[PDB]
Amino acid sequence: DFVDKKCLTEKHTHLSCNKVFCQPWQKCIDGTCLCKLPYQCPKNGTRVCSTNGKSYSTYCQQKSFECYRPEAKFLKSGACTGGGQFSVSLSNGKQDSEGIVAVKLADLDTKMFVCGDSWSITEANVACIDRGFQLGALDTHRRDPDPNSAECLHVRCRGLETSLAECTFTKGVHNSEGLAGVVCYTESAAPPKKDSFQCVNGKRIPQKKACDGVNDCVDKSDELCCKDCRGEGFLCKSGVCIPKQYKCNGELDCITGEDEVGCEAEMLTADMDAERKFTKSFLPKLSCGVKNKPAKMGEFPWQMAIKEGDKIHCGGIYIGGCWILTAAHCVRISRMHRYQIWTSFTDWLRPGFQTVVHSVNRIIIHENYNGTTYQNDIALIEMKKRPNEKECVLSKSIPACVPWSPYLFQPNDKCIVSGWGREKDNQKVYSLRWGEVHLINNCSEFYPGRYFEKEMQCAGTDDGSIDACKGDSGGPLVCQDVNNVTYVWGVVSWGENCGKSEFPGVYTKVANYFDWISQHVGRSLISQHNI
Template structure:
């Protein structure tokens, strides 16, 4: 019995010891896992911080992509409607260029009409192949064991060029894989295979949006260059899966490494990895709207930044690589130029006079301001009500002017616009008075709150002698509300009340202008009265502002090419030049779709 008790006691003791030992081991394991998790959290946090240095997280929530015209230019075969690039119908294309051939063997009247059909029908058979005649062998592409070949003029040629991700995306798109490439690399050639040609594609460069490599720039060279360059191998993106923590989910659901964001290369194949940046890597250019543009796209004649930063300061003597099919690039440029409205033209030296003026001092405001010179603001107009000067207005092209809705509130009044005017009390040779035949106030204008304080003025009998001259040139209409961010220096002009004149009620004889900075988060100053569609500009200390009589006049901002955009219409404010209450303007970009729906092709050609 004692023997049994010893065995039982020993067994229990061993069991307790084992249990205690296991608990200790379990505790160590949990502690180890916790330490590992903490290390992982620190690593993830470090990655997140590094990632946040390049991107703007709040912007990423908007899911911008290559069809978001708040961020990008629409192609000439598209138009911006409701902040999206929408397909034109073929007949809306500019009448530029000759017949072209599609990959499906179709003959189309022009490149733009071909792209319009491709855009509408989402069919690759309408992708571009070549210019006439269509009897020529079509431009084709094939991939064998990852190696890329192009058929140009009947011969299958290996691609030996250094290829970037946008070019690889275009190649995969032509192969029928819309999400573009996963990887692209050069592999050294072992032996001459799969081709009998003595030539190879030794240069190949795409923008990234193309649906056919025939739209890209390429150059043919001797096949022996492949010995040095190697063959291009692409791996197209085919998987559908969730993205892990080290990856960015593109707007099209493709997963790309976060380390490849904001480097100028369109890794996503829809540009969503390059549209929400606060800095760029790999020598890419940062646009004012937060887009990164690759070095290869700078000064190429095809603007990628809404403010044209990528096409500014380009010299005509800059050496460019020669390609065998530069005609397609020239064709696109011709179409783009034909589609652009004539506006804000700096060829008259319009804005250079403004930009070279010295910085205004504290008491030099539009309620004071600086006197303008003749033709300095050729879009500026004066609005007359029953022959009495009452407000400002801005010429926007065709037969149309833009002003504030509160300036045309009198129903039975006779309204005229006076153009080409510098001094109100002097009859000038450039001056003309035009009867307004139609007034279109914004349908949701609220006279109590000044919400939607914009109106369009139609003049049927424009004196075409004065159209598009140094004295009368339209300001451009911005399509993106992101084009000019807070802090941008802009210019207001008008004949409003001047502070330093002997009588405060007295308006100046000569047109005046003032520099004003755009101000963000303006609801902090004006509370609930500041609503969507409004913009603040001026200075918080009240040293620069617009005033009574400036209403309806323009707030002009300039892009990198010195083109003038009417960013705001003088609307309302808390007295004039009051500290802590910057002036408020109707934000014209917010009304782009409405303006376009009223004016149509009179301003917007396509």
């Protein structure tokens, strides 16, 4: 069983930014890729024309207009000097849904066939959606070539394009593989439900083509919830099946980026895929998560501490600007003027010159926070801004990246918990202390009726020697990805018999609350990869 049954209930699609990167012309909001405004595009690009006859500065502008108006499909690149249309036709087919694939290019006046050797179900899907069949293609066929025709086009499509004009066409010769054929998907020809996987959009495909790494669904719904990939498909840590050719090809296809680690013909039309990849390089890049038992300086530049009076009530996580993430129960609004923020220090009794202290300006506690079940135990701390400084900057602190999806990390992943918590035998600790823990797949057995998987996350050590005690509340549960980037996965919420085995610490799943934080701080400050 290569398909994860649990994930399928979430009905993830290609627009689910928690499972797949958004296109350059979209933005991830409330866990869904929402299309950008044509204004929002980067101004570097190539001029193009749509089927409606309007010219656009960049390809992504045309794609955004596509995302609002479906009838405004891309037609050709460059200026609209010529009025040649882009049409596809099927011939020698019993049913209008099937037939030999023939394409009439915008700049060519002769309808002529396409090669069959480089023909896949992705190109078939694109051809069928271009013909008007919203549910795409059903199958693929290679028929014999016309002896009177010696020329054909090899076509390459990403799988998300709306018309073949977005695909790349190359000059080719009729070879032994013949010409390409297609049968568009129809409800009457849909496979029986017994041995078929259900796409989100209603398309039915054979079970063997699900989680094979091949985009057999119209909206990719068959490749986002997988336990393993069939054939040559590459499996992400987040359970996404990707073809092998997308590995080590220079762009991040997996969410965590493991597809790009350990990496050492006459152009009939422009490469819109090359434009899309080129456009991706111009999106703003965020600099977070990279760094320049007791710990030392710089090992945790994101480590924040809130002081009430002369005692550190709780810990905190630096996010960027004047914003700090901390458990909700750690602070109260009524004590607004009493909290202090301490950074870049090891000993609270003996701070150094590098230590600086800031006051708290605003605290946001999650509205749905429950003080009994500790659900939604997150609070946002706004550091007091310097009146003569345009932007809140901490010269000696590096913010840690906030995860945007709950699928960034999996069970048993190595993560780091830190804080000023209590030592063994309740001894007072006067130095920042850091320990290692491992994530647990299930936690309802240890805390039945109280653990909430969507909002709370359980982690701990097998031996239980290293554990967060009282006072570690608000402390970070950080993890490092394949690229050594630090992500704050969780914040210390509560713990029962801290320091004992089988009683793991419970941390709120911060990735589930990315929308709330982003809407409270400004999305662009904390977001990476157009998310």
